[model samples]
Target: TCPFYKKIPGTGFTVDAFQYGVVEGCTAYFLTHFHSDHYAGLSKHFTFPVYCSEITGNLLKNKLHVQEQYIHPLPLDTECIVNGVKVVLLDANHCPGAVMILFYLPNGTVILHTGDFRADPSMERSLLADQKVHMLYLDTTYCSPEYTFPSQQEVIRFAINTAFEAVTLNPHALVVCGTYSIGKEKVFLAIADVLGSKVGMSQEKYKTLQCLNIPEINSLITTDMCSSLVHLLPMMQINFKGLQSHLKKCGGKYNQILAFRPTGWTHSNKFTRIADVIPQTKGNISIYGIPYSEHSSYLEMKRFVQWLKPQKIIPTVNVGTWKSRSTMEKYFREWKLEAGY
Candidate 1:
C-alpha cells in the first residue's frame, strides 16, 4: 500500500503506481511547508514518519494540534539522513515556518523542492546559492508576469495605517479584517504599534509568537526587530464570526476594536459609517479588506525561477481541471525557462 495519495475526487488523475512507488518505500516524508495543501493529507494518508524544520514542527503542533512524537524537527541548513537519503531544509520566506526541502541520493542525484517560495533578495540569494542543486520541483502557481505583488513591508504598512485611521475616526466603530490564524500576530502588532496601546491576544497566539523567540518592542508589541514581519494572518479566517468574537473580548479600554477577518462588518444596512477612513474608497466602520496571501505573484515567480536557474521544473499540489489545465500548463512552460526569451 502507498503511504500517501492526492486526488481531486472528481478529476480522473487519481493515483499512479509509479508515483506510489516513490512514497511507499520512502523512509521519511519531507514536508516543505505547513500549508493545508501540503500537510493536510499527510496526517491521514501517510502513516510513515514525517520530517520538517523547527518552526514548521511547532506550527503543525499548534495549528493542527497534532502529536509531537510523529514529527522529526531539524533546524534550518541542518543535514539528516532518512533511509540513507540525505536532506536539508532552507528558508522559504513565504511564512515563518515555511521552508524548501533539498534531497540528495547516494547515486549523485539531487533534488531541490522550491515548495511555495517567494523572491526575498536577502534570503533567496544566499539560500539558493548554498544548494547548487540538480533537479528542481518549483513553485509555479503564479508563474506569470502580471502578478507583481507588493512587498511585505508595503502591504503591512498599508493594512496598519488604514486600520488606524478607520478606528481613530469612529469612536464606536468595530473594525474587522479578513486574515488567517497562522500569521495573525503581525496584524495585531501593527494595530498595537499605531495605537500605542497593548492589544491582548489569546494565550494560543501569544505562545505561537513566543516560539519564534522574538524580542518585545514593549512588554506586548511584536515587530520586525523582534519577530518576523513576513508572517501575516491568512485571509480565510477573517470570515468567521465565532473566531472574531473570541478575539475581540481579549480585554482593552479602547472603544474601537480591530478584528482580523471581515465577517460581521459586511451587513448592508447603515451601520454608522465614517468618512475619514484612511482607505477613503473602501467604506468604513473601519473594515480593512487586505487579504493575507502566501503564494508568489506571477512576476515574483518569474523572478524566482530566473534567480535559481533550475534546468527543469515540476509543479505539484495543484493540477487544474481540463478547462484550466492547458492554460496553467502553458503558463508554467513559458515562465519556467530563463527570463527574457
Candidate 2:
C-alpha cells in the first residue's frame, strides 16, 4: 500500500489525512501541496480542519469545494502551533503554493517532510543549514542515477525554442504544449509572452489561474480557442489517440499540429544529457519530449540527503508493498553507501 499519512511518532496529529475510511485517528491535518496525488480521497464532506499555504487553502475552497471554515492558511517561513507541534512552512518550488513542512515536536525531535520539491539553493542555505533533522519523510520518486534531467529553466528555454521553430517551419500549423492542471503555468506564460499570443484553457483551469493572482499568467488566459495560435492543453490530453481525435475535429483549419511534453522521463541514459529535445512523429502531428521536472534528480537527492543528514530516511511511496519496498531499498541502500552515511 502507498503510505499517505505519517503519524508523528508520539504526537496524535497526522500529516495530510483525516479519519476517512482508509485512515484513522488523524486529529489535525497538514497539507504540503494541492497536487491531486497528494490530495487524493479528500472531498467537500471532510470535517477536519486542514493547514496549508494561503494559495492552497484558496484552491481547497474553490477547486476542491471544501468548506472555507475548515481551511486554515499558514504563512510561509513563519512558525505556528498545530496540536502542540511547532510547524513552519517553506516553499516547495514544485508548483504554485506547494510547500515543505517542518515540525518541531515537543519530544525534542525535528522532523522535515518534503512533500514534493525541486532542489533550491536558498532552501539549502536557510532550512537545511545548521539544522539536525531527526526523521525525514522524503519524496523518493526518482531515486536512481538513471533519472538525470536538465534544470527547469534550461528545459523551458528548449520548449520555447522548439515551439517557435515548429510554428515558423509550418506557418499554418497550431502548437500545443502539455502541462499539469496547476503546475507548469510558467511554461505557458513564457511561451505566450514570447509568441505574443494568448493561451486557451478550460474554464476551470482559467479560474484556478485567476485565483493564483499572477499578473503575467492571468492576462494570457483565453477560453476562445480560435483566438490563439498556441494552445496550452492538459498533459493527459496530449497522447497519440487524443491528438488524433483533436486534429480530426480541427477539420482543415490547421495544416499541421506540433505538441511538446516537458517531463524528466525523456532522459533514459547519461549520454542523453546533451540532447535537449526528443522528437516523435505520428502522421501529420509532431511531438517533442522536453526534459523538465519538479522532482529532485538523483545527484540532487544525494546532496539533499547529505545536507540534511537525517537519522532515518523514510520513502514516502510503497511502504506497505514488499516488492516495491525491496526495489526502493536497492536504490536507497546504494545511495546511502555512496554518500558514506
Candidate 3:
C-alpha cells in the first residue's frame, strides 16, 4: 500500500512511481510490468516517455490508453542506451511482459532492478560474468522465511492433474479457477490444453488476455457458459459460501464444483512438502489452495542473492509504512553475509 518511488538512485531514472509525481532530474520513467501495484499511478493525462518491454507497452496502450509516442518498447536481452545509461532488459519469469532491468551507469557501476521477479537460475546466463552488479533493487514481497512455496511448474502440474481428474470423474463438474487480472494464466490455460476443454470467462476477461500475444487463447475461449466446464473467475468465489452461491446460481448445470485458489499463501517448507496439497472441503464444494506463485519463494530469493552477491540490496515492496523497511533489509543483510560478500 506504500507509494511507489519515482526515482531510482544513481541512474536519474524513475520507475513505477507515477503516484508520487515526477522527479525534476529524472530523464525517463520505466515500468517493470502491468500489475496494478507496479503501474499504480500511470494515467492518460501523464504523457511522459515511459520505457518498457514490447508486450508491456501494448498493455499500457490497451489497458490504460497511454499515448503511443510516449510509450517506448524495448527488446529483451539487448543492451541499449537510455538517458546516458546502458540498459538491458531480461525476462522476469513472473508473468508476461515482466522484465528485470540492468543499468550500467556512465561511472561503470552496475545496478540491477529486479522489477518483481521470480528468481531463476536461468537469469545467471543472461549476465556478463566479468561485470559484478553493485546495486540490486530487489522484489521483497515474500521476504519472510515463512513465505516459502514450490516452483510454478510443480504447482501447475498438480493443478492440471486434479482438474483433469475432477472433470473426468464427473463430466458435469465445473472446474472453477480463481485468477487475478493478469497472472496465473498458465494454470487454467494448460488445463484447457491438456483436456481439450472449452474455457469460459467474462468477455471482458478474455479481452484482457487478448492484449497479450498468446494465440492459443483464441481456441480455448467460449462465450457460452454451459459449453465451458472450466470457468475462470475471480478468487472471491473460491470460499465455501461463495462457491455454494455460485453453484446454486447455475441451477444444477454442474453436479459439483472444484475450485483452485492458486497462490503462495499456504507457506511451504522445502524439507516437508505438505503445502503441495492444502485442500479445504465443504460438502460437495472442494477448494485447493496450491502454491502457484509468481513471486520468488524465500529459499529461491536466498539462492538469487547469493548467486548475484551484489554490493548492496534495496527492497521495492513493503516499504513506506510506519513500521519500517528493516523487516526486509535484515533478510538482505543475512543473505549478503552468507553470500561471502
Candidate 4:
C-alpha cells in the first residue's frame, strides 16, 4: 500500500501514496499548514525537502518545534516547480498559516486545491481575481443548509460576556475555554481585544501568535499584557483523581485560573463527578461555548463553489460516501435552482 497513487485527470502522471507528502517523482511538496490533520504525518514519515509559505515555515520551526533541515521556505504567491509542476500558495483564510495550493502542470492544466478555507470576503476577492483556476478541490464539510455560524466578532463577544458573568459570580472560580493551539489564534486575539489587560495566554499560544508576523497585532498585544490580571495557563493533563490537585497547585489560591481548553473535550461520567470544574474568580467556572469553529459552514462552502464556477467540482474531505455524494448532488441541484441552473 506504500505506493498507492492516483492519476490526475489530464496530467498523464500519477501522484504516489506515501501519505506523508511523498510524490514519487514530484519536484517538491507544499505543506498548506501545520494543523495535525494536515501536517501530522509529515514530521515522522516525511523527510524530503518540503516547500511551504514563509509563515508556515516559521510556524513549523518555532511554534510546532519542527526540525529545520526538512523545511524550505517560499514567499506567498511565488511559483516553484516539483517534478515539472508549478506550485503556488494562495490565501487560505481559515487559519494564520493555512494556504490554498495552486498547481500548474507543464501541460497547461491549472488545479486549485482549497485547503480548509472559509468565505472570508477578503480571501474570496483574491481568489476571484485568479483566472487560471481549473480542476477545483473544494471543502464540502457543510454541504447541508443547517450548518452556519456567526461572525468572529460576535463569537468573541459571547465568550467574553460568558467569562465576565462567570467571574462576577464566583471570585475564586477558574474559567477555561478550549481552542486549537494554531488555528484558533484569532479567537484568542479577539479575547484579548475584549479582556484588554486581563487576558493571559500560555507559552504555546503566545508562540503561535508570534509566528503570525502581524505588526498591528504585535504592537497591540503581548504575552505579558494580561499577566497582571489573569494567570497565563499552560497545557496540562489531569485525570478525574488528579483534577483538584493539578488546578489548585497550578492556578494557586490568590490568582483565579482561566484555562482555555481544546474545543469539544468532555469528561466521562466516572471522571465528571470527582472532577470539580474550575470556577471563575467571581462566581462559577463557566465553560463558555461560543460559535467559533474551524471549518466553513454550508453557506460558505456553497458560495465558494459558486465563485469558482468550475467545470466540475470534487469534494476533499466530507463527500466520499454514496449518501454524502447524493446529498451533495441534491444540494447543488437545489443551489442551481434559484440561480437558474
Candidate 5:
C-alpha cells in the first residue's frame, strides 16, 4: 500500500522505501533523490543495496553515513541490469542528483517513475518523446491548475536580479539566499558567479557540493560568513527566529540583512505573479519569497503526460489519501481526452 515502494508487476525491484517498511522482500531499492520525504526511513545501519545517481550515492555515504558497499551509483543515460530487470537512469531535473527511473521488464512492460521532476523540454525531447511507457508514476506536487509557475531558468534570473538589486541598494548588507540542503545549488552558484564573490555555506552543505566534483562550485564555497557578502543558508535557517538571531549576532557590522527564499508556495494565488518578490521585514532583516520551483506546474504536468501517454498514471505522494487520489484521477481523465488519448 505504500506509494513510494510500488512493485513492478513482473520485476522484483522496489522504487523508494524507508528502512522501516515491507521493503525487505524487494530485490533492490531505487532512490530518486535525497529529500527527506523520498528517503524517509533510510539510515546508516541499512543492509540492502540501493541504486541512485552518483551524487545521491555520495550524499548517502557522506551525509547519512550509508555504507559505501551497499550504495550503487548509477550514471545517467546508462542502462544496467538488476535482478533481470533492464533499468535506465534519466535526469529528473528536480534537484541535484535526482533521477527518473525507467524499468524495462522482461515481460515487455516499461514502467517510468518520475521522482519529483520539472518537465523540462530538453529532458522530454531526449528521453521520453519516443519511448514507450506502460505505467507512469507522476510527481503531482502541483497537480492543480492554480499552481502555474515560471520555468526554473526564469526564476533563477529573477532571483539573481533581485539579489543584485538588493546588494546595490544596500552595499553593506548581507544577502542570504535560502535553499534546500541539496537542491537549488544553481541559485547560489549564479549569485556567486555574477557578483564575483564567494558564497558562504555550512560545512555540511559545502561538503555535499564538493562531492559533486564541480570545480567552479568548489572554488566558490566558504564556511566563513564574513568572507562573502552572499550567504547560502539552508531553508530551515531562513525562518523568523533564525534570521532574528543571525541579525542580532551581526551587530551592525552590515547595514542590513536581506534574505531570499525561492520556492513554489509563493505563487499559490492570482495576485502573486512569478518573480514578484513578497517581502516580510522584521527589525533590520527583510526576507523575500521568490517563486522558484523545480516541480512541474499543472500545465507542464498535463503536457508531460500528453507527450508520454502512459497507459496508467499513479501519483507518488498522497496515494493513500482518498481526496488526493480522486483529484489526480480527475485531472488525469481531463488531460487524457484533451491529448486525444
Candidate 6:
C-alpha cells in the first residue's frame, strides 16, 4: 500500500493512513487490520475516527492505547451509515481481525477494498457476490503468476510433520517456530498438537493471543519454558546468529535447534509442495523457511477479481515502482478481461 491510498479519491474516508496527523481532506480513518504496515501512521495521539473489526478495536485500545471514543468496530457483513456513506466489513482471511472494507456511495456505486487477504472459495457467499462492484482496491503483494504458493493448511501441516520428523529422530533438538507479532499462529499450534506439548512463550506474547479471542488455543500456550518442547519466537530469531544467541540464552537445553521460519516470501513456483523446499543447516542449527502466506497468491488474486468482476482494479501494493505497478496493471487487465472484457 502507498501513502496515496490513505485517501480514497473523492470520499471523506481514509483506509489506514499516510500519517495520523491529517490526510488533508479525509474525515474518517478505516483500519483494515492490526498489522503495522497498514496501521503505521496511527498512534496514541490520533484523535480522528477510526473504524475496524472488534478485535482490532480492543488491540488498539489496550495495546496502542488509542482513546476508545475515536475507535469504531464495524460488525462484519452488516451495512451501516458512516458520515453519510454506507459501509460494510468482511473477514479478510489475512490476519486476526483483518477485514476487506466496502463503501456504498450516494452515486449508487459500490467500492470494495480488500486490505490483505488469502482468497478462498467461501468468499463466493459474500454480499458482493450478487452486487456490482464499481472498483476494487486489491492487495497486490503476490500479483505475478510465478508467485504461486501452497495452501495455508498444507504449509502448516508440512511444518508440523517436518518438526515431528526432526524431533522424533533426535528427541533432543529444540523445536522453535519463527513467527510474526500476529498471524502464523497455526504453525506453532499444530506443532504443539502433534507433539502433545504446549507452546512456550512470554506472558506479554500471550496477551496478543487473548486479544485475538482464540480461547480454544489457550491451553496450548505455556509461560514456562521447561513445560514445553516447542517454543514460539519472533521471526528475527530464525537467522543463524540469532538462533546461536537464542541457544546460548536457553542454557543449552538441546543439542540442536530446528527452527521453522514461517513466511511465503521464500516460496517459489519451482516447489509444487512446500515440503519440497529443503532446510538450511549450519552446524547445530537448521532453518526451514516454509511457504506459509496470509496474502493471496497469483491465482487466488485472479480468482477473486474474476468472481467479483469489478469495473476497475487498483493495486494497493507494488505501486511504488511504475514498472512494477504497470506489470500488475497488465495482469489486472488480463484477469479482468478473462472475466469479461
Specify the highest-TM-score model's number. 6
Clash count of each predicted structure: 9, 0, 0, 20, 1, 0
> What lDDT does the true structure give each of the candidates?
0.53, 0.77, 0.80, 0.58, 0.80, 0.83
Worst 10 residues of 6 by lDDT: 266-275
- The alpha-carbon deviation from the true structure for residue 272 of candidate 3, after best TM-score superposition, in angstroms, is 6.4
Question: 201-226, model 5: which lDDT tens digit per residue?
Answer: 77877787887756666578888877
Query: lDDT tens digits, residues 1-341, model 3?
Result: 22334356677687776666766776788988998977988888877789999989888888798889899999998989987788999998888899988888787788888898999888778763557999888888878888777677777788888888888888888888887768878888888877777778887787778887887667878767777778888887679988888888777888798888876665345445833455788788898877777899888888988988888777787777645487777777787777668
Candidate 4, run of 10 with poorest lDDT: 265-274
Model 3, residue 269: C-alpha shift (Å): 5.5
Give the per-residue lDDT of model 6 (tens digit) for 29-72: 89999888888877688888998999999899888889989999
User: Which candidate's lDDT is highest?
Assistant: 6
**Which regions of candidate 3 are displaced past 4 Å?**
1-6, 128-130, 249-251, 267-278, 321-324
Q: After the best TM-score superposition of candidate 5, give how far the Cα of residue 81 lies from its true spot, in angstroms.
A: 1.1
Descending-TM-score candidate ranking: 6, 5, 3, 2, 4, 1
RMSD in order of candidates = 8.1, 2.6, 2.5, 6.3, 2.0, 2.0
Task: Please write out the lDDT profile of model 1 over residues 1-341, one tens digit for every residue.
Answer: 44222321111212212224344234455666665656655432344556777877777676665667777788887777756666677887666777877667666656777676765666565545765565666666555444444455655676677666765776544444343434435655676667655644335555666665446734663333223211233354443454344335534323444454422122221332222223212222223444344666666666666676666556653544564456666765676553643
**Candidate 2 C-alpha lDDT tens digits along 1-341:** 32444666666666665334444566677788888767876779888878899998888888889998889999988879988778888888888899988888887898888888886666887655656889888887777778787778877787778777777787788878887757777777777777778988778777888777576665687888777777877788888887877777666778788887766565354666534446788788888776667888878877878767677888885566788678877876676787777
C-alpha positional error of residue 214 in candidate 6 after TM-score superposition, expressed in Å: 0.8
- Candidate 5 has a TM-score of 0.93
The pairs that clash in candidate 1 are 177-260, 177-261, 178-261, 179-234, 180-233, 180-234, 183-232, 183-233, 238-261
Instruction: Evaluate candidate 1 by giving its C-alpha RMSD to the native, one decimal.
Output: 8.1
lDDT of 4 by residue, 38-128 (tens): 6655553356666677888888777556678877777676767655666777877777777877777677777777777776657666644
Please report the TM-score between candidate 6 and the true structure. Answer: 0.94
